[PDB]
Amino acid sequence: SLLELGKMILQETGKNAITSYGSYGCNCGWGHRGQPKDATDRCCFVHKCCYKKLTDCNHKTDRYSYSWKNKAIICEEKNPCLKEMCECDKAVAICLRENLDTYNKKYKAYFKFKCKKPETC
């Protein structure tokens, strides 16, 4: 669920998921689609491609089990659909952290800013 995703994002990036990524660029923001503005935004495109293909559970509301152990995310989920959700979320947390060096606050509030047509997953 968004609860596990939010916690993973804090653990890896040190940031608040809602305020720092909830409206960022053309892909991180919620409901946002379009060509990525930068590497951070590309992480979010990959993330949505990852979870939107899962048909058997809900990315937003279904909780799964994971641990922050030895300073790393481990997906410890039995349900195959929920394990794939966890792996999608783990991947975006890592990706956002690895691209913190180009995180740009100009994209932070981008809901009303125009985006190019999205590319294919």
CATH number at residue 2: 1.20.90.10
Per DSSP, the three-state class of 27 is coil
Residues 43, 52 contacting (CB under 8 angstroms)? no
Dump strand ranges (E) for 7-106: 66-69, 72-75
Contacts for 52 with CB less than 8 Å, ≥ 6 apart: 59, 121
Cα(79)–Cα(42) distance, rounded to whole angstroms?
A: 28
Q: For residue 116, what are the domain limits?
A: 1-121
Which residue, among 1, 32, 24, has the nearest Cα to 96 in the 3D structure?
A: 24
Tokens 């783990």 belong to 90
Dump strand ranges (E) for 1-121: 66-69, 72-75
Residues 47, 32 contacting (CB under 8 angstroms)? no
The catalytic site residues sit at 47, 89
Question: Which method was it determined by?
Answer: X-ray
Tokens 């899962």 belong to 54
Q: Count up the domains in the chain and report the number.
A: 1
Cα(78)–Cα(92) distance, rounded to whole angstroms?
A: 21
Structure tokens given for 93: 């947390």
Q: How far from 106 is each of 98, 103, 111, CA to CA, in Å?
A: 19, 9, 11
Q: How far from 96 is each of 28, 79, 93, CA to CA, in Å?
A: 10, 26, 5
Burial class from Cβ neighbours inside 10 Å (0-12, 13-18, 19+) for residue 81 reads middle
Residues 65, 79 contacting (CB under 8 angstroms)? no
